[PDB]
Amino acid sequence: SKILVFGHQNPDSDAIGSSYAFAYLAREAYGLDTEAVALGEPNEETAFVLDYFGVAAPRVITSAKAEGAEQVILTDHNEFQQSVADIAEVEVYGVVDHHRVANFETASPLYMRLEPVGSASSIVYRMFKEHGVAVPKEIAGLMLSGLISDTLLLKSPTTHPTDKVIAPELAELAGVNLEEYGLAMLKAGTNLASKSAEELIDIDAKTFELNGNNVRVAQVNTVDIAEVLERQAEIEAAIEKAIADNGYSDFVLMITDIINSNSEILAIGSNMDKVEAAFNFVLENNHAFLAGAVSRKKQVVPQLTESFNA
């Protein structure tokens, strides 16, 4: 029977790109009856990627059991709360990911291929080369885009030396110029004007427990920090509501400039002294500039973590 292959809830480009590519690879090289599906519709950055290479969005599902599947393959995630609603009721045949492992468990052995690299799509690509399988131009496009999206065009410190090697091979296969296409697709996910502030602060947001404090950390990509900060009133009203509704001790929003690879940090809550101490900066009107920062998990969360435990 069919094995469904999917990325996380609130799919990003790497989630869609990795699962679409892996379902193809599995059919071609592993003898598997796989289908790529998605857990949500594409965001604007991914809608652009899909358009550019002329691939339809993988269909959305909400229950793996409803779709007839007894087995699934997860890509770009493993944590059960990031997965399909009924993940505990199906077998995990396999996982291809680049994140920490938590909230994840199986009854039986499985395939796992995890590497601490820039994207799941990087791993999937290298698996096409291992098995001598040709990469269709549109699948190369999708994988390249996964890698560019997760690392902001190889600028993030989550970029591994192997990523820097495969990026030009992927550009060639995809038929694009690396820097030009990369800039183009990243730009497509920076038009936030038509979204409400509530939506904005929940586009890419997670909660971290830091020495007993529930700290919410969101990120948005932009070509212009000032354009985001010019909506500051409604953003602060959304964040105060979020703090009120959810019991967050603190809310930190990363406003990430994709052109210059820096973030502005807009933060509100009980422990602002610890935010200032984490980054050696001074909040003015709830915000300060953080040079070089584009990775939540490498450049903001560990810094807060240390500071909150100090």
Residue ranges at the known binding site for Mn(2+):
8, 12, 14, 76, 98, 150
User: Site for Cl ion (CB under 5 A): which residue of 60, 62, 63, 100?
Assistant: 100
**295 Rama class: left (phi>0) / alpha (psi -120 to 50) / beta:** beta
Size of the site for Zn ion (CB under 5 A): 7
| Residue 196 backbone phi and psi in degrees, to 5 | -70, 165
User: Site for its own copies (CB under 8 A): which residue of 60, 101, 165, 237?
Assistant: 101
| Residue 87 backbone phi and psi in degrees, to 5 | -40, -35
Q: How far is the CB of 65 from Cl ion (least distance, A)?
A: 24
Stretch that binds its own copies, among 42-50, 106-114, 136-144, 268-276 (CB under 8 A): 106-114
Q: Which residues contact 165 (CB under 8 A, 6 or more apart)?
A: none
156 binds Zn ion (CB under 5 A): no
Which C-beta is closer to its own copies: that of 44 or that of 91? 91
Q: Which entry of Cl ion, its own copies, Zn ion, none binds 111, CB below 5 to 8 A by partner kind?
A: its own copies
Spatial separation of the C-alpha atoms in residues 70 and 18, rounded to whole Å = 21
Q: Which entry of Cl ion, Zn ion, its own copies, none binds 266, CB below 5 to 8 A by partner kind?
A: none
77 binds its own copies (CB under 8 A): no
For residue 113, give the 3-state DSSP assignment. Answer: strand
Q: Which residues contact 118 (CB under 8 A, 6 or more apart)?
A: 98, 147, 150, 151, 154, 156, 158, 159, 160, 163
12 binds Zn ion (CB under 5 A): yes
C-alpha to C-alpha distances, 285 to 99, 178, 237, 282, 303, nearest whole angstrom: 34, 38, 14, 10, 21
Q: How far is the CB of 119 from Cl ion (least distance, A)?
A: 12
309 binds its own copies (CB under 8 A): no
Q: Hey, which residues between 86 and 125 contact Zn ion (CB under 5 A)? A: 119-120
Name the site residues for Cl ion (rule: CB under 5 A): 99-100
